[PDB]
Amino acid sequence: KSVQVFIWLCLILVAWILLFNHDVKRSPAATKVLKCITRTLISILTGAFFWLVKTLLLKILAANFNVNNFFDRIQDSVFHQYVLQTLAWTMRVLMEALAAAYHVFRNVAQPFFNYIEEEDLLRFMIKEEVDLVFTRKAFTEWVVKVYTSRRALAHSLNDTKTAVKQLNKLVTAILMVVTVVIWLLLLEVATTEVLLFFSTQLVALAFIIGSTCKNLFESIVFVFVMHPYDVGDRCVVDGVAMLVEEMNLLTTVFLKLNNEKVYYPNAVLATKPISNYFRSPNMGETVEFSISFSTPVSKIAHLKERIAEYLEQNPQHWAPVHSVVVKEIENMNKLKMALYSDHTITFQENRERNLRRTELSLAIKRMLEDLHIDYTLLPQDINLT
Amino acid sequence: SRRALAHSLNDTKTAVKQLNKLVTAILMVVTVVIWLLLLEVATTEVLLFFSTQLVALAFIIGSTCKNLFESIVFVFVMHPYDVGDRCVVDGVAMLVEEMNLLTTVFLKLNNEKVYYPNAVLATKPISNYFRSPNMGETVEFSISFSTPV
Amino acid sequence: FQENRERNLRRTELSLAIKRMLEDLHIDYTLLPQDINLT
Numbered sequence A: 001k002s003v004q005v006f007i008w009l010c011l012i013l014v015a016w017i018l019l020f021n022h023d024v025k026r027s028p029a030a031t032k033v034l035k036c037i038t039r040t041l042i043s044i045l046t047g048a049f050f051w052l053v054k055t056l057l058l059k060i061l062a063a064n065f066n067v068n069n070f071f072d073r074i075q076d077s078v079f080h081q082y083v084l085q086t087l088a089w090t091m092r093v094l095m096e097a098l099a100a101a102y103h104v105f106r107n108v109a110q111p112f113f114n115y116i117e118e119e120d121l122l123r124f125m126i127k128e129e130v131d132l133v134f135t136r137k138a139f140t141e142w143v144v145k146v147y148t149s150r151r152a153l154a155h156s157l158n159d160t161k162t163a164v165k166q167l168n169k170l171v172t173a174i175l176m177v178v179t180v181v182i183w184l185l186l187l188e189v190a191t192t193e194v195l196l197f198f199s200t201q202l203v204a205l206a207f208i209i210g211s212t213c214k215n216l217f218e219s220i221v222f223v224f225v226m227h228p229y230d231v232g233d234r235c236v237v238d239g240v241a242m243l244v245e246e247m248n249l250l251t252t253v254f255l256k257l258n259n260e261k262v263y264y265p266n267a268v269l270a271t272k273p274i275s276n277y278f279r280s281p282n283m284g285e286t287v288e289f290s291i292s293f294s295t296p297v298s299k300i301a302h303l304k305e306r307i308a309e310y311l312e313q314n315p316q317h318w319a320p321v322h323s324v325v326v327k328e329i330e331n332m333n334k335l336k337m338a339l340y341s342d343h344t345i346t347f348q349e350n351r352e353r354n355l356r357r358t359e360l361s362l363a364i365k366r367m368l369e370d371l372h373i374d375y376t377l378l379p380q381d382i383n384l385t
Numbered sequence B: 001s002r003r004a005l006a007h008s009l010n011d012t013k014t015a016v017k018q019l020n021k022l023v024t025a026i027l028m029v030v031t032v033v034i035w036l037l038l039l040e041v042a043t044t045e046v047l048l049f050f051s052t053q054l055v056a057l058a059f060i061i062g063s064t065c066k067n068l069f070e071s072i073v074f075v076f077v078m079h080p081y082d083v084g085d086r087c088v089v090d091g092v093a094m095l096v097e098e099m100n101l102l103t104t105v106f107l108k109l110n111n112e113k114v115y116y117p118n119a120v121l122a123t124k125p126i127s128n129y130f131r132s133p134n135m136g137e138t139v140e141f142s143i144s145f146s147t148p149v
Numbered sequence C: 001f002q003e004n005r006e007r008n009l010r011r012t013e014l015s016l017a018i019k020r021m022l023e024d025l026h027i028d029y030t031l032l033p034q035d036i037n038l039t
Helices: A002-020 A028-086 A089-096 A099-108 A118-124 A127-133 A136-187 A192-226 A297-312 A350-371 B002-039 B044-078 C004-025
Strands: A234-237 A240-247 A251-256 A261-265 A274-276 A284-292 A318-330 A334-343 A382-384 B086-089 B092-099 B103-108 B113-117 C034-036
Touching: A002 A028, A028 A089, A028 A118, A028 A127, A028 A136, A028 A192, A089 A136, A099 A136, A118 A127, A136 A240, A136 B044, A192 B044, A284 A350, A297 A318, A297 A350, A297 C004, A318 C004, A334 A350, B002 B092
Parallel strands: A382 C034
Antiparallel strands: A234 A240, A234 A274, A240 A251, A251 A261, A274 B113, A284 A334, A318 A334, B086 B092, B092 B103, B103 B113
16 A cells, blocks of 8 residues: 555656646746645655655564564464364454363263363364364363463564554654655745754754653664563563563563562663563472481482482473582581472463472472481580589 | 584574674665765755754664674674573573574573673673683582691 | 583582591581580
């Protein structure tokens, strides 16, 4: 549409120029109005070119956001469509897009059949498709997680669209003011002195509002170019974790672990480190405990073997890889000990991570209790009088 | 090691490609404006209005391409580290993941992704484990003052 | 230090060796004696 209107306007301008290109001076009054009209056509042509470049910038930004998120958005949409069947166009579909779902899934599954019914999937989709898509409780949990992910993707898309719309409004206002001033200058109504007075007032005001649109530009380049995080991702700033809520050009709203709303200046974040749990791979875990310096090495080996067995017998929560490291020796009476292991998920699920850490700590406590590992304070010698 | 070298080469190629795109856009805008000026279509007053708008916008986007230039001179000229090398910043170790013109992605010991502004790193010390020689070790323990020599 | 896991394991092994060697040598640490006057 933009190129069509641009060609329309340019053809109109050239046609007008050709008609009056001939040197036919109807009257001195006609010349002034003709010059004013031509200046108006040139000014509106410049405005149309500005609009074209503006929409080009907006479209390239939208395409960058698409390459960033629309792939996962379309994947989630396809997964949801496949699940529903078992039980651009992609951008439009994404924009358009618990107990009840679990009940529906259970009803679809054959009675007294915990595993997914192959016949039901086959009748609704091909066997290969069903296998690729693939415990009633596990299926319900997966459906709930997929729905939550789709909702988060929709919220992220809406936030990005709102930010792009606000940026479009701002740049359109800038274009409007630029084109009106361009038309005024072309019309040549103001004399010299007033023009330089306007110029000096303009450089003054330019410094004034530059002191702020510098921060604005930093914020937009931060949110767009670096793109450290998306909506709904858990991030840590200054050592405190929080969840992204709203993406604005000048600010970003975050929710702390205590459901406390926080407002941040986007410009400041550009000068601070940002960590993302959602984008990070499976995260590690650390536990701390201490034992006596007199503990035999055999007990330490037994504890290591028990830890390895416990970790390998629970793959769903902890990966087989693990390590036990001695930190430091305190007066050769206390031996600092720590265990390192990796979850099967990231820190995004804070509640699940905390529960798993508590379970691991309880397991370590029990295992230490059975092994009879004891810690004793340094003996004190007392001389009576 | 071969996989790490391939990843480093790919990251360097991607950074060079992005820099090429940026400089090519700058060249394109420069040449179009040069052609427009040579054609001599605009009159005087509009030319100085364009000039003042240009110096204004130049300050605006300079406030940021200054940091951009600092980041590129940091990643290229100093070249403190490569992809896959373990580095320590502010006393915390991490692993290089992605090399971007404006930022560098690092992974902490807990497999925690971190994003840094490349401009800031230029003003902070950087230590590289991969490029360093064999490292030392220290252990701490205490004994009684009455221990015989 | 690039191999953080290997470095940590080697440090732990060295610490255990130091612990054992100190244990065999019978090196002991004692807190400063405290004098108590009853009433």
